[PDB]
Structure 1
Amino acid sequence: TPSQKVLARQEKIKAVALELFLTKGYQETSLSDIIKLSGGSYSNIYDGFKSKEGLFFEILDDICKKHFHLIYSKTQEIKNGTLKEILTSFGLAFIEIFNQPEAVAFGKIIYSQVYDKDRHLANWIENNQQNFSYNILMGFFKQQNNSYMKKNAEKLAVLFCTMLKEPYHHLNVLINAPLKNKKEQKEHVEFVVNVFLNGINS
């Protein structure tokens, strides 16, 4: 199929771009480096492919796609679980994802574009909001028969993700702070989930 061939060609460009970002560095690599090693599989493929910035985000697209399904799965298959159980389910999958060297390596690439005048990053977030994981949590919240939970559902989703993620991913990215091993991951999830549901007065 001509369509399959196109997709295959696209997966080729991105795989090259990725290997360069990883091998040579994001800042070091120009589009042309990408076109050269993509050989006759480019010519001009240009839709998210006009710049190395677009390619990175086309790649990040895929990664976030795979992140969602994967978190949705540990979630989808739970037996009428309590809030606690779906909360710690999501948590484990979420936190494991952000303690992979890949989370950090892409993290660094994003942080480095802080002075991008082209603003590819703003567009990406502005136009990929539906594909973020917290929409899963936000979804379970509105299901709950709690007016507080239902009216604050989005803010709560973001708040819980942050609690699990936050000082830590940021320190990983900026100064290469060590990742959490699964034991630590589990610990922190229980910890956060408890404060979150029950608060510290107890």
Structure 2
Amino acid sequence: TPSQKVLARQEKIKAVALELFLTKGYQETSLSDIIKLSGGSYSNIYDGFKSKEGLFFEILDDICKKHFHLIYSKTQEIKNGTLKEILTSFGLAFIEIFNQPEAVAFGKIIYSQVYDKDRHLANWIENNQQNFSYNILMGFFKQQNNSYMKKNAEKLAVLFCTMLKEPYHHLNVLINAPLKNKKEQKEHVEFVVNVFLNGINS
């Protein structure tokens, strides 16, 4: 199929882009470095492949989509779970994701685009909020026969993942603070789930 070939060729470009980004550095790599190694899989690529920034955000699209589905499964294997249970399930899969070197490496790239006058980053975030994993958490909140949990469901989902994630990711990205190993992950999820569900008065 010609369409399979198109998608194969795009996959080649992105893989090249990522190899460069990881190897040469995002800042050091230009679009032309990418085109040169893409060879004859890149003539002109019209499907948003018009820049280094766009290639990066194409790659980020994929990664976001896979994190989402991985985290969905973890929660899906829940049998009438308590709120505690599904929060803990989600917590563990979410926190594990942000404790891979991958997440910090992409983190650095994003932080470095703080002064980019192009704002591909703003467009990317604006244009795929639906693809973010907090939406999974939002969905359960609404299914709680609790009026506080349903009216605030988005805000609660964001709160919880923030408690799990920060300021650690931030410090990982900015100064290369060490990642959490698995024990520490579990520890922090339990710590956070308790406060979130129960408050510190207890």
Tell me the TM-score normalized by structure 2: 0.99
Deviations along 1:81-138, one digit per CA (max 9) or x if unpaired, are 0000000000000000000000000000000000010000000000010000000000
Structure-to-structure mapping, 1:66-77, within 5 angstroms: 66-77=66-77
Instruction: Output the CA distance in 2 between the equivalents of 1:179 and 1:198.
Output: 27
- Secondary structure of 2:81's counterpart equals coil
- Secondary structure of 2:166's counterpart equals helix
Give the superposition deviation at 1:28: 0.2
Tell me the TM-score normalized by structure 1: 0.99
Q: Which consecutive residues of structure 2, in runs of 5 or more, have no partner in the other structure?
A: none
Instruction: Output the CA distance in 1 between the equivalents of 2:48 and 2:158.
Output: 28
Instruction: Output the CA distance in 2 between the equivalents of 1:134 and 1:190.
Output: 18
Instruction: Output the CA distance in 1 between the equivalents of 2:169 and 2:50.
Output: 30
Instruction: Output the CA distance in 2 between the equivalents of 1:37 and 1:171.
Output: 34
Instruction: Output the CA distance in 1 between the equivalents of 2:197 and 2:39.
Output: 54
How many residues align? The count is 202
Give the superposition deviation at 1:196: 0.1
- Partner residue, 1:159: 159
Give the superposition deviation at 1:77: 1.5
Instruction: Output the CA distance in 2 between the equivalents of 1:44 and 1:129.
Output: 30
Bigger drift between 61-70 and 40-49 goes to 40-49
Q: Which consecutive residues of structure 1, in runs of 5 or more, have no partner in the other structure?
A: none
Structure-to-structure mapping, 1:1-202, within 5 angstroms: 1-202=1-202
Give the superposition deviation at 1:47: 2.3
Give the superposition deviation at 1:76: 1.0
Give the superposition deviation at 1:57: 0.2
Which stretches of structure 1, 4 residues or more, deviate above 6 A after TM superposition?
A: none
